[PDB]
Design a protein around this motif. Structure first.
Motif, PDB file in Angstrom:
ATOM      1  N   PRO A  21       0.828  -1.212   0.000  1.00 28.13           N
ATOM      2  CA  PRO A  21       0.000   0.000   0.000  1.00 28.13           C
ATOM      3  C   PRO A  21       0.856   1.253   0.000  1.00 28.13           C
ATOM      4  CG  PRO A  21      -0.680  -1.588   1.710  1.00 28.13           C
ATOM      5  CD  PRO A  21       0.684  -1.980   1.251  1.00 28.13           C
ATOM      6  N   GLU A  22       0.397   2.271  -0.726  1.00 23.93           N
ATOM      7  CA  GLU A  22       1.065   3.556  -0.605  1.00 23.93           C
ATOM      8  C   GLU A  22       0.772   4.224   0.734  1.00 23.93           C
ATOM      9  OE1 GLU A  22      -0.691   6.486  -3.464  1.00 23.93           O
ATOM     10  OE2 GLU A  22      -2.004   4.806  -4.012  1.00 23.93           O
ATOM     11  N   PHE A  23      -0.281   3.811   1.440  1.00 23.68           N
ATOM     12  CA  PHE A  23      -0.676   4.506   2.663  1.00 23.68           C
ATOM     13  C   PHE A  23      -1.243   3.500   3.651  1.00 23.68           C
ATOM     14  CE2 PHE A  23      -3.853   6.632   5.365  1.00 23.68           C
ATOM     15  CZ  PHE A  23      -3.146   7.721   5.865  1.00 23.68           C
ATOM     16  N   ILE A  24      -0.779   3.581   4.900  1.00 23.49           N
ATOM     17  CA  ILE A  24      -1.226   2.732   6.001  1.00 23.49           C
ATOM     18  C   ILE A  24      -1.412   3.615   7.222  1.00 23.49           C
ATOM     19  CG2 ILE A  24      -0.640   0.838   7.563  1.00 23.49           C
ATOM     20  CD1 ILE A  24       1.192  -0.151   5.125  1.00 23.49           C
ATOM     21  N   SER A  25      -2.513   3.417   7.949  1.00 21.43           N
ATOM     22  CA  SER A  25      -2.697   4.104   9.220  1.00 21.43           C
ATOM     23  C   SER A  25      -3.209   3.123  10.266  1.00 21.43           C
ATOM     24  CB  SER A  25      -3.658   5.292   9.086  1.00 21.43           C
ATOM     25  OG  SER A  25      -3.682   6.034  10.298  1.00 21.43           O
ATOM     26  N   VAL A  26      -2.527   3.061  11.413  1.00 17.67           N
ATOM     27  CA  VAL A  26      -2.874   2.141  12.494  1.00 17.67           C
ATOM     28  C   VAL A  26      -2.938   2.921  13.805  1.00 17.67           C
ATOM     29  CG1 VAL A  26      -2.130   0.119  13.847  1.00 17.67           C
ATOM     30  CG2 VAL A  26      -1.931   0.093  11.323  1.00 17.67           C
ATOM     31  N   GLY A  27      -3.967   2.654  14.610  1.00 20.78           N
ATOM     32  CA  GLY A  27      -4.040   3.171  15.967  1.00 20.78           C
ATOM     33  C   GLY A  27      -3.688   2.120  17.013  1.00 20.78           C
ATOM     34  N   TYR A  28      -3.225   2.586  18.174  1.00 22.11           N
ATOM     35  CA  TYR A  28      -2.815   1.710  19.267  1.00 22.11           C
ATOM     36  C   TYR A  28      -3.322   2.260  20.585  1.00 22.11           C
ATOM     37  CZ  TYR A  28       0.739  -0.236  16.073  1.00 22.11           C
ATOM     38  OH  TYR A  28       1.395  -0.771  14.992  1.00 22.11           O
ATOM     39  N   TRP A  70      -7.445  11.843   4.647  1.00 23.09           N
ATOM     40  CA  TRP A  70      -6.096  11.893   5.204  1.00 23.09           C
ATOM     41  C   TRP A  70      -5.096  11.191   4.294  1.00 23.09           C
ATOM     42  CZ3 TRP A  70      -8.430  10.470  10.604  1.00 23.09           C
ATOM     43  CH2 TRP A  70      -8.914  11.655  11.195  1.00 23.09           C
ATOM     44  N   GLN A  71      -5.515  10.092   3.654  1.00 20.66           N
ATOM     45  CA  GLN A  71      -4.653   9.400   2.697  1.00 20.66           C
ATOM     46  C   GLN A  71      -4.256  10.323   1.546  1.00 20.66           C
ATOM     47  OE1 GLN A  71      -6.265   5.746   0.991  1.00 20.66           O
ATOM     48  NE2 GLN A  71      -5.229   6.153  -0.967  1.00 20.66           N
ATOM     49  N   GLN A  72      -5.230  11.015   0.962  1.00 19.75           N
ATOM     50  CA  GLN A  72      -4.901  11.926  -0.133  1.00 19.75           C
ATOM     51  C   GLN A  72      -3.978  13.044   0.336  1.00 19.75           C
ATOM     52  OE1 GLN A  72      -5.079  11.915  -3.230  1.00 19.75           O
ATOM     53  NE2 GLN A  72      -4.813  14.050  -3.846  1.00 19.75           N
TER      54      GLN A  72
ATOM     55  N   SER D  51     -13.097  13.717  -0.030  1.00 22.31           N
ATOM     56  CA  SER D  51     -11.976  13.795  -0.955  1.00 22.31           C
ATOM     57  C   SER D  51     -12.485  13.389  -2.328  1.00 22.31           C
ATOM     58  CB  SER D  51     -10.831  12.872  -0.512  1.00 22.31           C
ATOM     59  OG  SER D  51      -9.608  13.240  -1.110  1.00 22.31           O
ATOM     60  N   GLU D  52     -11.698  13.693  -3.363  1.00 21.25           N
ATOM     61  CA  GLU D  52     -12.018  13.169  -4.687  1.00 21.25           C
ATOM     62  C   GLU D  52     -12.135  11.651  -4.622  1.00 21.25           C
ATOM     63  OE1 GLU D  52      -9.320  14.327  -7.817  1.00 21.25           O
ATOM     64  OE2 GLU D  52     -10.433  13.235  -9.363  1.00 21.25           O
ATOM     65  N   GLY D  53     -13.179  11.113  -5.243  1.00 24.14           N
ATOM     66  CA  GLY D  53     -13.316   9.669  -5.296  1.00 24.14           C
ATOM     67  C   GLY D  53     -13.986   9.032  -4.097  1.00 24.14           C
ATOM     68  N   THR D  54     -14.549   9.814  -3.181  1.00 18.81           N
ATOM     69  CA  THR D  54     -15.347   9.226  -2.118  1.00 18.81           C
ATOM     70  C   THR D  54     -16.474  10.174  -1.733  1.00 18.81           C
ATOM     71  OG1 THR D  54     -15.288   8.076  -0.001  1.00 18.81           O
ATOM     72  CG2 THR D  54     -14.039  10.145  -0.117  1.00 18.81           C
ATOM     73  N   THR D  55     -17.626   9.596  -1.405  1.00 17.89           N
ATOM     74  CA  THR D  55     -18.785  10.338  -0.928  1.00 17.89           C
ATOM     75  C   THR D  55     -19.463   9.506   0.150  1.00 17.89           C
ATOM     76  OG1 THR D  55     -20.338   9.344  -2.467  1.00 17.89           O
ATOM     77  CG2 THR D  55     -19.193  11.306  -3.240  1.00 17.89           C
ATOM     78  N   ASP D  56     -20.320  10.152   0.942  1.00 16.17           N
ATOM     79  CA  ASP D  56     -21.097   9.435   1.946  1.00 16.17           C
ATOM     80  C   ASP D  56     -22.259  10.319   2.361  1.00 16.17           C
ATOM     81  OD1 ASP D  56     -21.829   7.262   3.551  1.00 16.17           O
ATOM     82  OD2 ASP D  56     -20.488   7.736   5.205  1.00 16.17           O
ATOM     83  N   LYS D  57     -23.258   9.682   2.953  1.00 16.49           N
ATOM     84  CA  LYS D  57     -24.458  10.377   3.379  1.00 16.49           C
ATOM     85  C   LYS D  57     -24.169  11.308   4.547  1.00 16.49           C
ATOM     86  N   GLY D  58     -24.956  12.370   4.631  1.00 12.92           N
ATOM     87  CA  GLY D  58     -24.964  13.216   5.814  1.00 12.92           C
ATOM     88  C   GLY D  58     -26.105  12.861   6.744  1.00 12.92           C
TER      89      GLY D  58
END
Ligand SMILES: Cc1cc2nc3c(=O)[nH]c(=O)nc-3n(C[C@H](O)[C@H](O)[C@H](O)CO)c2cc1C
Ligand SMILES: [Cl-]
Ligand code: NA
Lengths: 265, 98, 200, 245
Positions: A21-28, A70-72, D51-58
């Motif tokens: 993956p170009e992007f990974i996010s993990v919480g601890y 956040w990924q973008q 973001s570009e390429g994602t949407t969701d309900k409010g």
């Protein structure tokens, strides 16, 4: 309670190998992964059952949307960094944000970034400023410090929001996080004396060797605290024997408010 | 660019006893960047059914991973961990010392 | 539940000060926004607070108390252009905005030389309506709606003749009824004793 | 440097009709939003696009859907319009979401009115009334009045034009229309405006005054079956000339 912490990491890679993956996010929470997200799955998912069982699907749906954003943002930021470093090839970008609730009830909070695994920018939430390690970081520091409101926002997040969520997760996972499994400790000869502990939780443990009641800090070989695979941890510390004189050696172990001494006959 | 080579530690879950089922662990830590290859070996041969934790993140920005497989140690069988990383010109083998 | 409350409407005088209050009860807190929305226009950003204290931005200041869950927007030296709605919004723990219903701010102009009068406008050859204009009264006067369903009375409106630095209040009344007359058009309103009624 | 651009500004719809609202931002923002604004309540989010390429309900997605067509554009679709979707719709954008202090930037708004049938749609009647001579002699000023009456729904823009150019100084138009029959849910509307000038300006016989009301009503595609004229989008005006007398 013992000291506890909540941390979220991000990893960005500029030219990843196939599948990676170009992007990974993990919480601890403490040493326990609680959440994961990456650019392949595009979904934020629980990594601990006590997280899954206490947060409804609309929670995971909401943060999935936020992590896609956040990924973008991370991609854009890494593109800027590697262009200004004038670097070719694949480079990494990392972020860590988190807080601790210490035993005495005091708190800490932290936010920092790394490029290729080295400190890049470090937030100071008391002076409300960014510490920059080089001139690429210096450029970003100036852009971020020009947005005073976002520094105030991060201070509030670290000191108030982060601690509120940590307390919420600590209660969710209390059966796991607040338990104590004391170590099993033994000594054997290998010439060096090896003091070995296993089966303990939490992983925080202090082992050392004493000679005649004096701690010889520089003469001790401290092993790492290692995961055993079953939720508990193991560790060791060794000291070398002087065959030219008699001495009383003793292994000392402290774990979760209990001290143990094993005198070597 | 500073790259960090993986520390590699091979150990059983419980103190090993011949004929008693256990778990062989390979803990790989402190490395950077994150791409890495880890195999457990039995007598020099790669074990197939081998599990691993998700990639994990340390505060100093390095990464770590636990690889493991269920096994029953014997007197004769030798075990090891084989790790490849960009910091390693050839794969590094760390035998299980009991 | 999460909620946010602000007064529905406020009225203050030109040149004076007004404090618009906003209280909130939310699932966590990541900051409080004020927006300005002129009638029929888009909301525009005014301020953001997230730590405790007061921030100033020109004639406007915004205050926040996190422990009280309270903010105010303070407008100094009120001008007619400050007539607008003011929207309070809180970003919660999940970064979602909770919007207050808005405070409509009404500004009374300072009328230098009141000259209250009801004037009969000239008939239009294309309309059956008779039209009366109540104008130049001081801002304390209130204009009542009509009690006759065939008489229409609009509320007071402030016009600004900018070249002459002159403002004036007016309300319009009209009807096509035969018994409609400017002398009685505003009878349901309390109008100044000295209101001028030119002879018919 | 246009900011947020949404269309249309006004639209009348029949129950069951489809409608797409357009929205574009040229600020290179990543996050876009669609809100509805209704009297007596705060803005309610319909759908968003973090973001570009994602949407969701409010909060209120039912009856709507969205398309984040690209980084710039975020369309809102009403597939089967309902009277309850009568509202003012606002598109907004922000640099990111999931940050604290970043503000929203709003488009101009789109006012939608959904009706069971178009039988009660009317353009305004527009009339202009010349200043009182008594006002002129008493104050040395002259107030013209414009009345826009009998229109429905409240989708109008009234402007004054002096010598062929729009003016704003000396103008006051009611911020809200009057309901001609306040007890009816489908009451037609009235709107008054004043333009006040100096008596000298009014007394030049070549000064020309026009009150213009743009009405947003039906278009060619809308079916019309009533005996009266189809109430299409149109401009209704009335005029006056300065009087030397
Ligand atoms: C419930 C919750 C979940 C979060 N999940 C993440 C996450 O997956 N990754 C992350 O980097 N920050 C996460 N954050 C932390 C924080 O919102 C984010 O790092 C902001 O960038 C901090 O200013 C989360 C915050 C909350 C309250
Ligand atoms: Cl703990
Ligand atoms: Na929907």
């Amino acid at each position: 309670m013992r000291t506890h912490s909540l941390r979220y990491f991000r990893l960005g890679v500029s030219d990843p190998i196939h599948g990676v993956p170009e992007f990974i996010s993990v919480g601890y929470v403490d040493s326990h992964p609680i959440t994961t997200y990456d650019s392949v799955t595009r979904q934020k998912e629980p990594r601990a059952p006590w997280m899954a069982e206490n947060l409804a699907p609309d929670h995971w749906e909401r943060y999935t949307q936020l992590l896609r954003g956040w990924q973008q943002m991370f991609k854009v930021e890494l593109k800027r960094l590697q262009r200004h470093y004038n670097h070719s090839g694949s480079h990494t970008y990392q972020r860590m944000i988190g807080c601790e609730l210490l035993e005495d009830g005091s708190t800490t909070g932290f936010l920092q970034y790394a490029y290729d695994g080295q400190d890049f920018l470090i937030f100071n939430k008391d002076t409300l400023s960014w510490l920059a390690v080089d001139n690429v970081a210096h450029t970003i520091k100036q852009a971020w410090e020009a947005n005073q409101h976002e520094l105030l926002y991060q201070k509030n997040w670290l000191e108030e929001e982060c601690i509120a969520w940590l307390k919420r997760f600590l209660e969710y996972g209390k059966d796991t996080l607040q338990r104590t499994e004391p170590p099993l400790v033994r000594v054997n000869r290998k010439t060096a004396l090896f003091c070995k502990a296993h089966g303990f939780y939490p992983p925080e443990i202090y082992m050392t060797w004493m000679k005649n009641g004096e701690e010889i800090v520089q003469e001790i070989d401290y092993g790492d605290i290692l995961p055993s695979g079953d939720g508990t941890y193991q560790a060791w510390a060794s000291i070398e024997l002087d065959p030219q004189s008699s001495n009383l050696y003793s292994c000392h172990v402290e774990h979760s408010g209990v001290h143990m001494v094993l005198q070597v006959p | 660019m500073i790259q960090r080579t993986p520390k590699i530690q091979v150990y059983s879950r419980h103190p090993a006893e011949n004929g008693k089922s256990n778990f062989l662990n390979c803990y790989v830590s402190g490395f950077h960047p994150s791409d890495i290859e880890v195999d457990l070996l039995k007598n020099g041969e790669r074990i197939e059914k081998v599990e691993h934790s998700d990639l994990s993140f340390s505060k100093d920005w390095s990464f770590y991973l636990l690889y493991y497989t269920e096994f029953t140690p014997t007197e004769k069988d030798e075990y090891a961990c084989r790790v490849n990383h960009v910091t390693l010109s050839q794969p590094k083998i760390v035998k299980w010392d009991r | 539940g999460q909620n946010i409350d602000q007064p529905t409407e406020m009225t203050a005088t030109e040149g004076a000060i007004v404090q618009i209050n906003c209280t909130y009860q939310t699932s966590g807190f990541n900051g409080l926004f004020w927006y300005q929305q002129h009638a029929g226009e888009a909301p525009t950003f005014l301020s953001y607070n997230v730590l405790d204290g007061l921030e100033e931005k020109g004639r406007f200041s915004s205050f926040l108390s996190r422990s009280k869950g309270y903010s105010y927007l303070l407008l100094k030296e009120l001008q007619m252009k400050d007539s607008a709605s003011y929207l309070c919004a809180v970003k919660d723990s999940n970064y979602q905005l909770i919007w207050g219903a808005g405070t409509k701010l009404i500004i009374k102009p300072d009328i230098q030389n009141p000259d209250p009068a009801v004037y009969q406008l000239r008939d239009s050859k294309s309309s059956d309506k008779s039209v009366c204009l109540f104008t130049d009264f001081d801002s304390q006067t209130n204009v009542s709606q009509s009690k006759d369903s065939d008489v229409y009375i609009t509320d007071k409106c402030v016009l600004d003749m900018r070249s002459m630095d002159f403002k004036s209040n007016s309300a319009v009344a009209w009807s096509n009824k035969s018994d409609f007359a400017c002398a009685n058009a505003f009878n349901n309103s309390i109008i100044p004793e000295d209101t001028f009624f030119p002879s018919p | 440097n246009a900011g947020v651009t949404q269309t249309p500004k006004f639209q009348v719809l029949k129950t069951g009709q489809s409608m797409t609202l357009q929205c574009a931002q040229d600020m290179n923002h990543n996050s876009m939003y669609w809100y509805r604004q209704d009297p007596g309540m705060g803005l309610r989010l319909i759908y968003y696009s973090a973001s570009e390429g994602t949407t969701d309900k409010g909060e209120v997605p039912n009856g709507y859907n969205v398309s984040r067509l690209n980084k710039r554009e975020f369309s809102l679709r009403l597939e089967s319009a309902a009277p309850s979707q009568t509202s003012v719709y606002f598109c907004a954008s922000s640099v990111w979401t999931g940050e604290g202090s970043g503000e929203l930037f709003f488009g101009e708004g789109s006012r939608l009115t959904v009706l069971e049938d178009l039988k009660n749609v009317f353009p305004p009647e527009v009339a202009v009334f010349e200043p009182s001579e008594a006002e002129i002699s008493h104050t040395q000023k002259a107030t013209l009045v414009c009345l826009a009456t009998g229109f429905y729904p409240d989708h109008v823009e009234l402007s004054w034009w002096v010598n062929g150019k729009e003016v704003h100084s000396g103008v006051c138009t009611d911020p809200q229309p009057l309901k001609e029959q306040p007890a009816l849910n489908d009451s037609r509307y009235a709107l008054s405006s004043r333009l006040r000038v100096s008596a000298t300006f009014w007394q030049n016989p070549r000064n020309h005054f026009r009150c213009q009301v743009q009405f947003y009503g039906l278009s060619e595609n809308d079916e019309w079956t009533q005996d009266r004229a189809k109430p299409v989008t149109q401009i209704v005006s009335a005029e006056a000339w300065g009087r030397a007398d």
